[PDB]
Amino acid sequence: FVNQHLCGSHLVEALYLVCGERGFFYTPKA
Amino acid sequence: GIVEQCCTSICSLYQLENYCN
Could you say which of A2, A5, A22 has the minimum Cβ distance to residue B13? A2
- CA trace torsion A18, A23, A28, B3 (10° rounding): -10
Q: How far apart are the first and last CA of chain B?
A: 16
Largest CA-CA distance found in chain B, in angstroms, rounded: 23
Contacts of A1 (CB under 8 A, 6+ apart): A14, A17
Min Cα–Cα distance to chain B from A19, Å: 5
Domain residue ranges of chain A, discontinuous segments joined by +: 1-30
**CA dist., res. B10 & res. A22, Å (int):** 23
For A12, other C-beta atoms within 10 Å of its C-beta total 15
Resolution of this model in Å is: 1.5
Could you say which of A4, A23, A29 has the minimum Cβ distance to residue B11? A4
Report the structure determination method. X-ray
Long-range contacts formed by B8-11: CB under 8 A, 24+ apart: B8/A5, B9/A5, B10/A3, B10/A4, B10/A5, B11/A2, B11/A3, B11/A4, B11/A5, B11/A6, B11/A11, B11/A14
Cross-chain Cβ contact A2/B7 below 8 Å: no
B11's torsion region: left (phi>0), alpha (psi -120 to 50) or beta?
Answer: beta
Strand partners for B20: A24
